[PDB]
Design a protein around this ligand. Structure first.
Ligand SMILES: [Mg+2]
Lengths: 240, 73, 230, 100, 69, 239, 304, 70, 100
């Protein structure tokens, strides 16, 4: 506190508050969760409609970095767009220098070191974003990663980013995710969103579900749950 | 602590005449009885409960704080 | 106080941050250096905080060329910078002139390096003073630089903590003509003035200059030298 | 349980046995520093020392003696000893040693 | 002198030591060894504690961060 | 008192500076402790892990980092500054092999690390990386070694090593430990490396809560112990 | 959960002689693996005390004979291994080993009149190894004291057993002094100190007694009869007035205990050497207190 | 190094009015009270016997060395 | 720090996770209930880390007993009490205090 202006200064007890201040700016964003089954990764983002003039698919938070890699950002949306273009550019140089797809364990290291560099100098500020990284391969399986604004990056089986970070992972861990298929996961992700405050004190929302795994043959794309609409049909039955 | 009546010169207690107050304390008792309701107040719903649980219930339920066996502040 | 910075003067006197940099020199480990008639003796103090620290890992007496050695009193992390600077600078003379650099020539140049960090305005000065020895052209030499950039030529001196007691010792002690073997005898006897309790073969670390080149002493001789020779 | 007793005989043995303080000879073992949280420790284990004799307690607010000129404060020292003279080892309980 | 030592343990082995001690800390040594025998229920100093009380108070160079020497 | 030089890296009156020595208490927010022990011809790293979540994985937690095939390390302090410190360590270990044609000594590497941490103190305008590094390695004609690098740019090699939160309690145990002249036959090393951390932290850990890196002069490759043989050394000390 | 280990222990107590007792130690590590589990409520302390009871009962049957070594080597087996067995970091110190050996020191109280002195002090020297660690905190804190007093009466006391008790005195004020039995233990060592002719140490450990008084109400023949050794302490140099103040203190109980020979010699012993104190105001009014007695004229030293 | 003990040793074997004053209770607030406490000592001293005024520490305020433009 | 002012010092620690249950059953004393309580099920779900504030946990469980007309205290009321009290502890700033 006064000793908290620059990002290159220490507190008298030994922490940087400019990193601490940017972490709870991610806290005010809506909840985006991630989960992986035994043969794929399923994303899911609670996204709220601003007033009414939103045109049903604008400014999405499910990006597409590589052929098999996408993001699940939450926080400052404009800061995540510039950070997503770094990961698009980083995966292109690995293709041009080595001739094959980027491993997700190596991709998250290159991004987190880039986020780390904005937490050291007084000229720039730390980012205000946190996001997810999911991929699938036949020689590596499915992985799911997690990057904070400080730059700590390691793997989970399931996660949540937003207001309800604790309130979502309470009921994620009561799932037998080690053996389910990622078609049964999709109907289970939608009830985790709709339990915790979809439109209670808010106005409206719309669910987005991204999708990667064995059924897509390594491709990353949005779900065909505009087809048959089964996520909302199965989750709205959990009213009682 | 008694408001006894004492002779001037002899300084000897003569009468008792207790419990006498001035007009300033008598003016402090409210005879207005204002008309404010809780519907007029908005945005303080946590503090509304924490007041009624603290003061109003010891005013009403003297024995509910007895059979449970705690002390209201 | 005006000070806070290095690129401006005080209204009355001199640069204050360079004076504060000299305070870190006085709070360092003690050291001593004596110029005898046939050589120069360097000796310093080196105690570990625990019994766990390997004493034969990091050295204090550090050779620059085959006839030039160097000690310090300040902060060891800043010491390793200008040592590596003085190594590469000493080779640049030898590539041009094909001749080992005289001891009065490094101190022209090493002090100009410590000069440059006293400039503007976001860098800090060093917190290290030095003692530089060597036997060039018969006569031996013993100099001393500072973080301000000046230099000297000593007969005998002592830096570090309690230097005023070692100075009044050496003022009462140092004569003009002794050999190198008598010089080490009064160089440990001035280290015993301000040292701590035990003084073993690993608490001190001593290097010398002959005319046969620079050499630092192994603890086999230093145990046998401190064995009952006062 | 470790601190009920570590504080006990470091107070008990000097007050019960002043004769060993002439078998070698030194008078002041003058007490421990109880530091940590507020918790319940400052007020409750002071009553754990009250288990044998003890009693005294009184109170030290650490504020009425801290007046600036200490010519009054030295009298405010001995003002509290007007009851501590009335007994055997009186046990001056002292709260908020360091608190202003 | 005003302390019942009563041993054959010679104190001048601590006179001849270096690590120069301030005069207040000499008073701390003899009082600490008084504690370091009575607390162990001894009616006399046996002066095997006197080594430990000497090594206790002499350790004041606390951290210094192993930095700037 | 100071007050004075407590924002940026300049001198104090008499005589120190505070921003570097605030990084020394920047390790302690990790809430962790690491122990390195060199007794004889082998070398042992031991460090606990702390997994606070069931959704959190197990493989992506380990602080044991393989620098080269014969040099391993462990990292304390805060997490994000630790990994960028390792990236410089992996990088300059390969430049030695390219420029000079042979394997880098473990002694030479801490010089190259602490000099990079030196410039950030001398020249300003970069935060000086509040993490600590401990190295082990095998040297020809020198035996095994244990080194420690500091955020100030200090380094010193020494036999028994603690870091993290509990240096002053673990090193106090190891001074009394390494004073007797007992030999260290590769299980005398490990059992003391366990029981020092086991009593200072007061955990006496369950088998799945730690890591143990090792190197030995019979197989100089850096080696992370299997969870099964961690249990074998744990049932060895408690017979 | 652990009732299977109990019915297997029902098998092994029948098969102590039908099967050999090493097989009881071969069924034992399965019950150790049950103790290795010890999770929350299933196979934890209360049922763990049952296998600890039955393994000691099998240790009773196996080493009731002069083949004693099995009960001892099973103890340094399990009591070094319990750090790996039940819970790491100082497991409970709560009913996992305590009453299993508190039964055994009760058995050492039984066998000391039967077994000879050699294998019982081999039994004691192997139980002192873990009693120095824990298990004598409280209930029962005198698991050490009922057997270290037995070590005194092995050779019936000497210089060494006085040193053996003075080194272990305050460890049960380090557990919790017992209004009565702790006072009864902390008195007993100084008559051993008088056997080693120690007097300055004797009065230091005697000054701990003075605050625990008025328990002679429930004490018939022990409280004010140990103080007949406290006058032996002040028998030494000259303190004649103080031990006549002492005789008036022990004057009361043989008037409660209405005797006419033990109480009469209390009148005899007090009237002899109030005289032998040097003259003072304290002697001058004490004789003015003790004269005028209704009981003093039973003796012709009323004339004296 | 045994400084205050020497002042206490004089107070025994003298026949004076020993006055010891810490050099810290007059560097306080309330502008003007500081210099009057110096007067309160000496008016109490010079009214009395041959006396000793022992100021304990002036490693506090004892040095001008600049004109204070503050 | 000389012998005679703070002759020996001692630090008090805030958590034990088992001296919770000691202090809990003290404060789960004179409060009417059934004996229905799994007291360890309180402790494992409790994260208070302060002995004076676990006193506040048993106070608010009686407030949940005032709620829904419980003359006894059900085991749910303590689990209700931890979610109210320990969440209120988390929402306060100025968390730097250390005795020297
Ligand atoms: Mg003084």
């Amino acid at each position: 506190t006064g000793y908290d202006l620059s990002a290159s200064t220490f507190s008298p007890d030994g922490r940087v508050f400019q990193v601490e201040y940017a972490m709870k700016a991610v806290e005010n964003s809506s909840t985006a969760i991630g989960i992986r089954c035994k043969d794929g990764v399923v994303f899911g983002v609670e996204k709220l409609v601003l007033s009414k003039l939103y045109e049903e698919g604008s400014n999405k938070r499910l990006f597409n970095v590589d052929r098999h890699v996408g993001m699940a950002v939450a926080g400052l949306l404009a800061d995540a767009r510039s950070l997503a273009d770094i990961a698009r550019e980083e995966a292109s140089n690995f293709r041009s220098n080595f001739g094959y797809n980027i491993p997700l364990k190596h991709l998250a290291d290159r991004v987190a070191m880039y986020v780390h560099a904005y937490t050291l100098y007084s000229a720039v500020r730390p980012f205000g974003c946190s996001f997810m990284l999911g991929s699938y391969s036949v020689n590596d399986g499915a992985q799911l990663y997690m990057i904070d604004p400080s730059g700590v990056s390691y793997g989970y089986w399931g996660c949540a980013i937003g207001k309800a970070r604790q309130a979502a992972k309470t009921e994620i861990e009561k799932l037998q995710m080690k053996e389910m298929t990622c078609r049964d996961i999709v109907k289970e992700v939608a009830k985790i969103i709709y339990i915790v405050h979809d439109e209670v004190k808010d106005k409206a929302f719309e669910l987005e579900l991204s999708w990667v795994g064995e059924l897509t043959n390594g491709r990353h794309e949005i779900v065909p749950k505009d087809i048959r609409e089964e996520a909302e049909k199965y989750a709205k039955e959990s009213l009682k | 602590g008694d408001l006894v009546g004492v002779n001037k010169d002899s300084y000897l207690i003569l009468e008792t005449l207790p419990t006498e107050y001035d007009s300033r304390v008598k003016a402090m008792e409210v005879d207005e009885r204002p008309t404010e309701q809780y519907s007029d107040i908005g945005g303080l719903d946590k503090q509304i409960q924490e007041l009624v649980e603290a003061i109003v219930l010891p005013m009403n339920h003297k024995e509910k704080f007895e059979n449970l066996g705690i002390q209201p502040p | 106080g005006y000070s806070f910075s290095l690129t401006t003067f005080s209204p009355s006197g001199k640069l204050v941050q360079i004076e504060y940099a000299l305070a870190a020199v006085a709070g360092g480990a003690p050291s001593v250096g004596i110029k005898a008639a046939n050589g120069v003796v360097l000796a310093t103090e080196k105690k570990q905080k625990s019994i766990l620290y390997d004493e034969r890992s990091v050295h204090k007496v550090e050779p620059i060329t085959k006839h030039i050695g160097l000690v310090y009193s300040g902060m060891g992390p800043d010491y390793r910078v200008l040592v590596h600077r003085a190594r590469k600078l000493a080779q640049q003379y030898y590539l041009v002139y094909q001749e080992p650099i005289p001891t009065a020539q490094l101190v022209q140049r090493v002090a100009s390096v410590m000069q440059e960090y006293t400039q503007s305005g976001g860098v800090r000065p060093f917190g290290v003073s030095l003692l530089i020895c060597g036997w060039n052209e018969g006569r031996p030499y013993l100099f001393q630089s500072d973080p301000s950039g000046a230099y000297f030529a000593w007969k005998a001196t002592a830096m570090g903590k309690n230097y005023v007691n070692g100075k009044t010792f050496l003022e009462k002690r140092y004569n003009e003509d002794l050999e190198l073997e008598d010089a080490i005898h009064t160089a440990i006897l001035t280290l015993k003035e301000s040292f701590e309790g035990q003084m073993t073969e690993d608490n001190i670390e001593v290097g010398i200059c002959n005319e046969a080149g620079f050499r630092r002493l192994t603890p086999t001789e230093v145990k046998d030298y401190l064995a009952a020779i006062a | 349980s470790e601190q009920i007793r570590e504080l006990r005989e470091v107070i008990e043995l000097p007050l019960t046995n002043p004769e060993l303080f002439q078998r070698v000879g030194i008078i002041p073992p003058k007490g421990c520093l109880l530091y940590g949280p507020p918790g319940t420790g400052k007020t409750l284990l002071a009553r754990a020392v009250a288990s044998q004799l003890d009693c005294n307690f009184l109170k030290v607010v650490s504020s009425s003696i801290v007046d600036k000129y200490i010519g009054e404060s030295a009298r405010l020292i001995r003002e509290m000893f007007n009851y501590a003279r009335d007994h055997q080892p009186c046990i001056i309980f002292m709260d908020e040693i360091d608190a202003i | 002198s005003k302390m019942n030592l009563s041993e054959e343990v010679d104190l001048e082995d601590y006179v001849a030591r270096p690590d120069k001690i301030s005069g207040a800390d000499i008073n701390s040594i003899c009082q600490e060894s008084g504690m370091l025998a009575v607390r162990e229920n001894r009616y006399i100093v046996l002066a095997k504690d006197f080594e430990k009380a000497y090594k206790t108070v002499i350790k004041k160079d606390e951290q210094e961060h192993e930095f700037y020497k | 008192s100071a007050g004075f030089d407590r924002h940026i890296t300049i001198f104090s009156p008499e005589g120190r500076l505070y921003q570097v020595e605030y990084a020394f208490k920047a390790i302690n927010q990790g809430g962790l402790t690491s122990v390195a022990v060199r007794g004889k011809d082998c070398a042992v790293i031991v460090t606990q892990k702390k997994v606070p979540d069931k959704l959190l994985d197990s493989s992506t937690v380990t602080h044991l980092f393989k620098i080269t095939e014969n040099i391993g390390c462990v990292m304390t302090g805060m997490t994000a500054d630790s990994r960028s410190q390792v990236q410089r360590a992996r990088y300059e270990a390969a430049n030695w092999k390219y420029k000079y044609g042979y394997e880098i000594p473990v002694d030479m590497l801490c010089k190259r690390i602490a000099d990079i941490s030196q410039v950030y103190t001398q020249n300003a305008e970069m935060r000086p990386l509040g993490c600590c590094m401990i190295l082990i390695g095998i040297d020809e004609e020198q035996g095994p070694q244990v080194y420690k690098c500091d955020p100030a740019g200090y380094y010193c090699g020494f036999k028994a090593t603690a870091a993290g939160v509990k240096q002053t309690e673990s090193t106090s145990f190891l001074e009394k430990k390494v004073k007797k002249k007992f030999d260290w036959t590769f299980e005398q090393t490990v059992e003391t490396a366990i029981t020092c951390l086991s009593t200072v932290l007061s955990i006496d850990f369950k088998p799945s809560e730690i890591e143990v890196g090792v190197v030995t002069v019979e197989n100089p490759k850096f080696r992370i112990l299997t969870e099964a043989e961690i249990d074998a050394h744990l049932v060895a000390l408690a017979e | 959960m652990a009732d299977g280990g109990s019915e297997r222990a029902d098998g092994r107590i029948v098969k102590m002689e039908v099967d050999y007792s090493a097989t009881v130690d071969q069924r034992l590590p399965e019950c150790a693996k049950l103790a290795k589990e010890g999770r929350l409520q299933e196979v934890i302390e209360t049922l763990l005390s049952l296998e600890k009871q039955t393994r000691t009962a099998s240790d009773m049957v196996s080493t009731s004979r002069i083949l004693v070594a099995v009960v001892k080597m099973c103890y340094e087996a399990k009591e070094w291994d319990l750090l790996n067995e039940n819970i790491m970091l100082l497991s409970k110190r709560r009913s996992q080993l305590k009453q299993a050996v508190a039964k055994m020191v009760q058995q050492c109280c039984t066998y000391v009149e039967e077994i000879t002195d050699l294998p019982i002090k081999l039994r004691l020297i192997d139980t002192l190894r873990m009693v120095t660690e824990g298990k004598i905190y409280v209930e029962i804190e005198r698991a050490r004291l009922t057997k270290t007093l037995a070590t005194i009466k092995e050779q019936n006391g000497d210089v060494k057993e006085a040193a053996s008790i003075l080194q272990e005195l305050q460890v049960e004020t380090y557990g919790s002094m017992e209004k009565k039995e702790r006072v009864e233990f902390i008195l007993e060592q100084m008559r051993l100190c008088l056997a080693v002719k120690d007097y300055i140490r004797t009065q230091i450990i005697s000054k701990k007694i003075n605050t625990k008084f008025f328990q002679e109400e429930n004490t018939e023949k022990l409280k004010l009869k140990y103080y007949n050794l406290m006058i032996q302490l002040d028998q030494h140099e000259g303190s004649y007035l103080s031990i006549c103040k002492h005789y008036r203190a022990i004057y009361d109980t043989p008037c409660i205990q209405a005797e006419s020979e033990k109480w009469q010699q209390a009148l005899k012993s007090v009237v002899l050497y109030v005289i032998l104190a040097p003259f003072d105001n304290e002697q001058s009014d004490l004789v003015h207190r003790i004269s005028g007695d209704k009981k003093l004229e039973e003796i012709p030293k009323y004339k004296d | 190094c045994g400084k205050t003990m020497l002042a206490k040793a004089v107070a025994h074997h003298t026949t004076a009015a020993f006055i010891r004053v810490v050099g810290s209770e007059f560097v306080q607030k309330y502008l003007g009270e500081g210099p009057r406490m110096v007067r309160d000592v000496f008016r109490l001293a010079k009214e009395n016997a041959p006396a000793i005024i022992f100021i304990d520490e002036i490693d506090a305020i004892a040095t001008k060395r600049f004109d204070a433009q503050t | 720090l000389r012998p005679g002012r703070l002759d020996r010092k001692i630090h008090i620690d805030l958590p034990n996770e088992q001296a919770r249950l000691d202090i809990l059953k003290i404060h789960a004393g004179p409060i009417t209930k059934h004996g229905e309580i799994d007291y360890e099920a309180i402790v494992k779900l409790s994260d208070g880390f302060n002995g004076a504030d676990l006193r506040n946990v048993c106070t608010e469980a009686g407030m949940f007993a005032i709620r829904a007309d419980h003359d006894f205290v059900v085991q749910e009321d303590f689990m209700k009490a931890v979610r109210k009290v320990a969440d209120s502890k988390k929402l306060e700033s100025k968390l730097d205090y250390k005795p020297v």
